[PDB]
Amino acid sequence: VTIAENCTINGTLRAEKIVGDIVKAASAAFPRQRESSVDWPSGTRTVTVTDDHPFDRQIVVLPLTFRGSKRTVSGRTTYSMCYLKVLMNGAVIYDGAANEAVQVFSRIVDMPAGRGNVILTFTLTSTRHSADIPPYTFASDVQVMVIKKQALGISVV
Amino acid sequence: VTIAENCTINGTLRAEKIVGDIVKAASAAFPRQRESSVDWPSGTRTVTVTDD
């Protein structure tokens, strides 16, 4: 069926695939490495978006908050840094580090139509205070949405 | 087309605008003003939502 203008269903629409201006969403938590009683985020999450749409799309990475720590023992101060590296199709697009203050990563990745699948890799690494004290870092979940760009519902200029 | 009851699609539904029980979204970044080797966010963004 090809409808050139408005189509109005007054009941229930049961569609398998929708290629409209709806939102797509995926989410995951970083793998946790643990010892004794404490764990920290350390690992990689790979998000694949297929180019199965006829219009360009925006992949929005929602605010991801990552933070390290500082510990002073016997007057000696040690840092536990949290490194977040974000790759688009194998090319580094973000490389951030947190020591004490929180760092927030939220980005827009322009995926066009027909260019191919877009792969976003989020690698997070935590460094220990010393050989005996494990890393003490925090990192929130990675959440990714796909939106339409230049849509008629919401516009942004 | 006007349908008074359920409509079922066994393939791909491709609509430009969808009006009902859906989650719309938009996003942008603030303009950045820069000098030498340092930039900072400073600017205006507008989000318009249509009453449709």
Compute how many other C-beta atoms are within 10 angstroms of the C-beta atom of residue A150.
11
Contact A115, A16 (CB under 8 A): no
Contact A93, A106 (CB under 8 A): no
Chain A residue numbers with beta carbons less than 8 Å from the beta carbon of B22 are 22-23
> Given in angstroms, what resolution was this structure solved at?
3.0
Q: Using an 8 Å CB-CB cutoff, list residues of chain A that contact chain B.
A: 1, 3, 7-23, 54, 58, 60, 108, 145, 147, 151-157
Q: Could you tell me the maximum CA-CA distance found in chain B, to the nearest angstrom?
A: 64
- For chain B, the C-alpha Rg in angstroms (whole number) is 21
Contact A24, A18 (CB under 8 A): no
Cβ contacts of B14 within 8 Å, gap of 6 or more: A18, A19, A20, A54
Closest residue to B22, CB basis, from A3, A14, A22: A22
Question: How far is CA A110 from each of CA A56, A59, A120, A147, rounded to the nearest angstrom?
Answer: 8, 6, 12, 10
Pairing of strands A76-80, A69-73: antiparallel
Question: How far is CA B2 from each of CA A17, A111, B11, B17, B22, rounded to the nearest angstrom?
Answer: 21, 35, 20, 16, 20
Experimental method for this entry? cryo-EM
By C-alpha distance, which of B16, B7, B27 is closest to A22?
Answer: B16
Contact A136, A127 (CB under 8 A): no
Compute how many other C-beta atoms are within 10 angstroms of the C-beta atom of residue B25.
20
Question: How far is CA A45 from each of CA A34, A37, A141, A149, rounded to the nearest angstrom?
Answer: 18, 24, 10, 25
